Amino acid sequence: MKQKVVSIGDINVANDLPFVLFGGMNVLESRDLAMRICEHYVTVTQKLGIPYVFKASFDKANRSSIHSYRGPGLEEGMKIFQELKQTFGVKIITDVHEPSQAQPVADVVDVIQLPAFLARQTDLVEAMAKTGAVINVKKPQFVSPGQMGNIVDKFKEGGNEKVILCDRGANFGYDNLVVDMLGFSIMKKVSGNSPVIFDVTHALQCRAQVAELARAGMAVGLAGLFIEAHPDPEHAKCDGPSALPLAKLEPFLKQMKAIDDLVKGFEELDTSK
Amino acid sequence: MKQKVVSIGDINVANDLPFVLFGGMNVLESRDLAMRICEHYVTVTQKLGIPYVFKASFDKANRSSIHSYRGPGLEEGMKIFQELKQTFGVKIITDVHEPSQAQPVADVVDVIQLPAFLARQTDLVEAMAKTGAVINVKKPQFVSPGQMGNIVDKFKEGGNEKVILCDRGANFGYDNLVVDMLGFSIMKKVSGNSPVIFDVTHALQCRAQVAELARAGMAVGLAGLFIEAHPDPEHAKCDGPSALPLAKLEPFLKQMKAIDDLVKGFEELDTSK
Amino acid sequence: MKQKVVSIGDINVANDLPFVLFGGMNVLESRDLAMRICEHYVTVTQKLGIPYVFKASFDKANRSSIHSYRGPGLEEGMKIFQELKQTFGVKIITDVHEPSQAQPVADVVDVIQLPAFLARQTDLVEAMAKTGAVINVKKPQFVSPGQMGNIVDKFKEGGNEKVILCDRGANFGYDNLVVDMLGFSIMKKVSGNSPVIFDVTHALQCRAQVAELARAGMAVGLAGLFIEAHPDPEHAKCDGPSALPLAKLEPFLKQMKAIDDLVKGFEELDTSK
Amino acid sequence: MKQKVVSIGDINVANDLPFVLFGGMNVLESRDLAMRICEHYVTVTQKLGIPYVFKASFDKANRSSIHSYRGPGLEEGMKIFQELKQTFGVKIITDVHEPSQAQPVADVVDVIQLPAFLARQTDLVEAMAKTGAVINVKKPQFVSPGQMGNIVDKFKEGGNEKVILCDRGANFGYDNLVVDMLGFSIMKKVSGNSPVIFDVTHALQCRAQVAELARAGMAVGLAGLFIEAHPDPEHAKCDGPSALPLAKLEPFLKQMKAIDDLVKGFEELDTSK
């Protein structure tokens, strides 16, 4: 039962391989903050031997008001990914909402993300399947692990088979997320052993709890980990979804590699019988 | 505490008024089936004294595969609403996905629907607020009743205050919906007493159970009821979301008016103290 | 599909019959308050043509601290049921925890209640099946409607078939209950059409919301309704589980009979096909 | 923030200490199977350097029918714990239902367990607080982590402060459990840093999934792990709650110690700021 590998450049993402980091920041506030954030990742990733794909959003469609911070935009934003790639030479992942945005970005970046709310948007899977780029499918909180067969299948059809699944937790009554550790196996199984990644930040909201959560995730064994940081977490340890104090990256990423390695090399165990 | 009224033509939708029906069919399969479906509504509505707004979808973005039945389309579909309005003289409600579709439809139809998955899509609320049309906001299964303040507020901002809220149940573990009867009061309260409607069909999936559910809903007291029917329910009593056997409309709508009336005229009761 | 009837004296409890009230108070604080509470029920029940079974607890095992108000006790409590029966001539229902309490009470009272937490306690079902009394099984928040087959079956075995099921809601994430209106049909079906009753008070906790909830329940159509009141609801409209302001009984019970009747006589509808 | 330690003989149970195993079997089927089961534990525990407390139930009150296998019984069962202690010299933990059973067992055994369904039974906490024995409180699926303050407090009152908390998952819609990894921190915090243990077997039901689950649990860092095994898992890898194939103990317990150690020694990390 050998794992499907998804390769973002030299980067080999798979559930049996050493874990990839899709770290970064929520939005592209400024380049000035983008570059400083990307700095700490690349330095600490490269030091600690952790494959790295940078992540920031150029657009927002989940603002609370209309006359809020949309963000850079499709046009202004892609230049800031040009200027980061050359300066640091890392792979960039960003979310895409409108179908028309799909091709523009697949050129600029390496991994495109399918936001959870739009996971069941065939108009967007169609148009994002076209690009031929590596897809990150965020697993909707309101969709069960087994239902992720259909979204991978829809991608297959559109031609694109370079797909990652990202668990960002599941609705647990009102205004609460829980992470179903069992979900990861089910998403692997139903996905032709596609790479599963745990979006630990977006699986929190209602902390010190980033740590304990992401360990548990990694101890299952995953292809990668999706995290967001901030130098001063919007002030509160949580910029909307719970952002990690940038400073604490290394001693945290220490803990994750330590588990990912201890776990990834394990006399394959079958409690089945 | 007098209710906010939303008027679709002569039709006055409000939580204290006699209940409006937003009945119809899932997709516009053919006009031949559209018109026959619309027939039974108009005849039974008009007989039974139930304000009526017809509902069918022109587009689908919730297909399971890409090379599936998209449906009529934005262009072919709107003609079939022209040809229904003149022939039957009823108000048409349809869902809208892409932001560009918003203005085209607000002309053709009376009520536009904001699909649950895209409820947190500011690009679409913005563009749908513009039209100035009556909005039906489907309440996401993964969003709590109190959170519906923000979506009504976002609509206010964009200029549009002619907004209905539609409960289509809430995620209850994996692959299961429950309807929180308490939700209706909370959505009223937080919405400036906006009209709340119960999408009974879309709150089912995993029946004979359409009946018992929609009673319970109506006994709370609601502005309206959102239902879909079929002559032969795709064969199974459930065309995706659980469709009502068209024949059983009258003896069912009998039951709903009977509750809506008994309830709507009630020495206002305060169990608060 | 004629309903199983359960007869508490002259009182005929069944899902097709006019609805029975199992109204009352949480604990037997004093007789002085017991009798005053029982007064308002009997007067308003008898006025309004609503079969009535009084309910109060003699014991508590759900106190928050040990050195709290246990309540009257097995010995002191049963005398206060003697003194209520003679004075008012109504049927008394009380909960039972220890297996040894089962026989003592089945003599003193008419209906014994199986508390939710102990629903899966064979030692207690065995001993409560023995009595031959009418059982009220509270449906655990953590047990699904279909699982109520097994508890009715366990009762059958022990000899006792005079069993009512009481829905008191279901766990909905942390520290939250939801009532699944669909549950009532499933509990009927799996229970040999046993009488289902809705414990509206105990299905609330986290109100004005008693009203809207109990309507919805009744509009499904039920054998009965389980409620608790207080003259001054411990001060807050909610003595632990949300207690109804005693004064508002009539104008509330007005609303319930009005639905129970409108519903109970209904050209039986099959949305199944 | 040093951890509260609970000492079962020489055995020191605490969230910072190396993890204790509360392994064993569901019921005492026969001594012949009891002793063979206990054999494999003691051999593999002792080999692998894992503190061990054996667990089996003498009684069952969660049978599906009345005329089912009650089990050994309070009298016949305690002799089989005598005969295991002497032969193997390990600490025995068993569940207790009736209040009268509490003192008898606290003599025979080292750790008594408070079953989840009876966690809110003051009559049993009172009587189990008396014994002065080490308590294992199973955390009800229908009770949230923060609510575990009250049960520890109730134990304090009755005199007994030698209390362990055991997470056995939480209700996740109908007939489904999820384990909230975040729960462990909250139960620690609210419990005066009491020892938290993860009942991995009882957190499954609806497997190969025992493995992935218990890793995740341990990677959080816990005082101990509660598991049940069988030579031939009732035939299916799951004797009611999902039992572990006895043979696979070592290569599984290998994995758990490997995480417990890697985790337990960790430059304490604060993602809080």
Residue numbers in the entry:
A (entry chain A), B (entry chain A), C (entry chain A), D (entry chain A): 1 to 206, 218 to 284
Paper quotes:
Here, we introduce an approach to reduce sample waste in SFX experiments at the EuXFEL. It is based on the generation of sub-nL crystal suspension droplets embedded in an immiscible oil, allowing injection with a traditional GDVN. We demonstrate droplet generation of 3-deoxy-D-manno-octulosonate 8-phosphate synthase (KDO8PS) crystal suspensions with a microfluidic droplet generator and show that the droplet generation frequency can be controlled by the flow rates of the aqueous and oil streams. The determined structure revealed new detail in a previously undefined loop region of KDO8PS, a potential target for antibiotic studies.
A room temperature structure of KDO8PS was determined from microcrystals delivered with the segmented flow generator. The SFX structure of KDO8PS was solved based on all collected data where droplet formation was confirmed via the in-line droplet detector. The mean of unit cell constant distributions were calculated to be a = b = c = 118.4 Å and α = β = γ = 90° by cell_explorer, part of the CrystFEL package. Of the 37,000 patterns classified as hits, 16,777 could be indexed and 15,777 patterns were included in the final set of merged reflections (1000 patterns were rejected by partialator during the merging) and used for structure determination. Detected diffraction peaks reached a resolution of 2.8 Å. Our structure represents the apo protein structure at room temperature, wheras the published structures were determined under cryogenic conditions, where cryo-protectant was added. Furthermore, the structures reported by both Radaev et al. and Vainer et al. have a missing, unstructured loop region (residues AA-206 to AA-217), which is believed to be part of the active site of the protein. In the structure presented here, residue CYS-206 showed clear electron density and was therefore included in the model. The electron density revealed differing detail compared to previously-reported KDO8PS structures determined at cryogenic temperatures, such as the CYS-206 residue and a different loop conformation in the residue range 246–251.
